[PDB]
Amino acid sequence: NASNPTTNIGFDEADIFDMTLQLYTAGSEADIIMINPAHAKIFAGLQENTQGSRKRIFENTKQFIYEVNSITDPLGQSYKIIVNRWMPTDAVYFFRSADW
Amino acid sequence: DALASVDGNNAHVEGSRAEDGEMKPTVIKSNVTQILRKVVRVSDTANTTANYGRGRELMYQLEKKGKEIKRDLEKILLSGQARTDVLADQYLTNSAADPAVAGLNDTHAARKTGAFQFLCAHGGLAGGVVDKTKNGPADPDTGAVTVKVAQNASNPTTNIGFDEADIFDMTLQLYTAGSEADIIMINPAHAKIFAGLQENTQGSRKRIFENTKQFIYEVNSITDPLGQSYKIIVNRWMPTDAVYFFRSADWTQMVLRAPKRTELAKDGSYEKWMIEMEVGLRHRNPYASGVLFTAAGK
Amino acid sequence: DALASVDGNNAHVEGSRAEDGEMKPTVIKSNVTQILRKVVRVSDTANTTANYGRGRELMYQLEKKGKEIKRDLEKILLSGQARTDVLADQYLTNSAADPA
Amino acid sequence: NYGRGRELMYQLEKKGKEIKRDLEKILLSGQARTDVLADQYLTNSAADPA
C-alpha cells in the first residue's frame, strides 16, 4: 500500500501483479479473484492514477461505468473478478475452482 | 561467415593485376553434443508398499526423471554453456582421428555442447561462461553488434534495472546484419518493463478506458521504427539477466540418440534404472540472432 | 510432490558408469472436519385453528435454518480459522496413547 | 552329475533349507524389534527428509 496514504487500512495498487508473477513461476493456472464488496471500488480505481499515465475518457456518453470485472497480467494470464458478500474485508484470494 | 566488403572506391584503369582473387572463403563452425542420464536408484523393499497415489514407485520416479531431464534440456539450451571437448583443432581429422587420445582409453573428458549465448557471436569468456559485461565484436559484412550490454539510461546508473528502450538499438543492429528474426524471449521478471512501455512519466504515453470493464495490462507485440514486427514470449527457464531474439529456422535441435530408458547391471541390493538422451544445438549464422545482457550504466 | 531443481551442469561422459541420483519424497498434509447443527423445535399447539399466512411453521423454520446453515458454511469456508482441535498438535498421533 | 543332479538347483534347494533353519532359529531364540522409527510405526509418516 505504497501509493495511497497511511490512512487506508491496506491494499496495493501495482503489487497485485507481483502475485500473478509468483503464481506463474510456481505453476498455478488459476484465473479468478474473489473480493469483498467493501474493497471493490479500489479495483475500479485501477483504471485511473494520479500520475499522468492512466485516465478515462468519455466522448459525450451518458453512461458512467466505474466498474472492472476482468484483469490481465503482463504474462498473459486473464483474471476474472467475483464479489463475495460472505468474505472478510481484510483478504483477497487468487484461486481456481477445481483446486478447491 | 560473411560476404566480401565493398572496399569503398571501385575505380579502374583498364587492368586488374589481382592476387588470384580476394575470395576469402567461408569459415567452418562446429558444435558438440553432450549426454544427459538422470540416474535413479530405488530399493527393493520400498517397491511393494501401499503407494496410495504414487502407485508403482519405480515408474513414478522414472516419469519424474523424464520431466526433470526435459526441464534440464530446456534450461541448458538457453544457458551459457561453452563448447568443451578434447578436440580443439582436430575436430574432423578423420584420417588421424587425434592420435593423442587412444592409448589410455580412459582420458575421456566431459562433452559440453555450445550454448545459445556462445553461438550468438560472443565477445569473450568470463572464465567458463560467456561474458555478460562486454559487447561482442563487429560483423565484417556491416557494422553490427548482436551482443550488447544494456545501458539503463532511465535510472541514475545505480539501480539494477533493465533498460526500457535499448531494444530498438539491438533491432537496428539485427537489421544491419540481415537477421529477419521476429521473436523475443524474456524472463517473467522483466515483462513489467514491456507493460510499462504503454505508459511513461513525461505524459506522452497513457492508456484509456472508455466505459470498459477491463484493465488489460500486457504487451505481446512490438514494432521497431524500421518496420520489423516482434512477438514477445515468456520463458521461466532463462537467466533473468539475459534476453534472446530467436528465429525458428535459424536454430535446430540435433539428436543422435533419442531419450531411452534402460537398466544397468545387477548383483546388488538395489534395482537400478536410468535414462539416456544425447542432444546438441545448431545455428545457421552467429550474426543472425541477437542477445542482450542486462546491467547498469558505468 | 514437487519436482527437483533443474540442473544446468549435467556433463556426463560416454562409456562410463551410472552413478546414483538424488530423489525426493512426497510431502503430506492433513486437516480436520467441522460439524454444524440446528434446532427447529415446535410446540404443536397450533395447526388446530385456521392458520392465516403460511402454514407448516415447522417446515418454514426448517427451510429457514437450512438456508442459515448454508450461509454459515460459506462464511466459514471463506473466513480464516486455524486447524483448531482438542488434540493440541497431536494430530499426527492418532489413537492418543494418553486416555487422560 | 550322477546324484548332485546339477550345480544350480541342488545348491539352491540346499540354501533354501539352510535359510529355513536359520529363520526358525532366529524366530524361536528371542529378539525385540529394533527398526529406527521412533513411535512412527503407524501414521505412515513418509521418510521425513533430513
Residue numbers in the entry:
A (entry chain D): 203 to 302
B (entry chain C): 52 to 349
C (entry chain D): 52 to 151
D (entry chain A): 102 to 151
Give excerpts from the publication.
Escherichia coli phage SU10 belongs to the genus Kuravirus from the class Caudoviricetes of phages with short non-contractile tails. Here we show that the virion of SU10 has a prolate head, containing genome and ejection proteins, and a tail, which is formed of portal, adaptor, nozzle, and tail needle proteins and decorated with long and short fibers. In contrast to other short-tailed phages, the tails of Kuraviruses elongate upon cell attachment. After binding to the host, SU10 tail, nozzle proteins, and short fibers re-arrange to form a nozzle that extends the tail.
The capsid is closed on both ends with caps formed by the major capsid proteins organized with local T = 4 quasi-icosahedral symmetry. The closure of the caps is enabled by pentamers, which are bent in contrast to the flatter hexamers. The hexamers in the caps are more bent (H4, H5; 149-150°), whereas those that form the tubular part of the capsid are relatively flat (H1, H2L, H2R, H3; 154–164°). The major difference between the capsid proteins forming hexamers and pentamers is in the structure of the annular loop positioned at the tip of the axial domain. In hexamers, the annular loop protrudes away from the axial domain. In contrast, in subunits forming pentamers the annular loop is bent 90° towards the capsid center. The beta-strands from the loops of major capsid proteins from a pentamer form a beta-barrel with a central pore with a diameter of 8 Å that penetrates through the capsid. The pore may serve for the passage of ions and water molecules from and into the capsid during genome packaging and ejection. The DNA strands from the outermost layer of the genome curve to avoid the beta-barrels protruding from pentamers of capsid proteins.
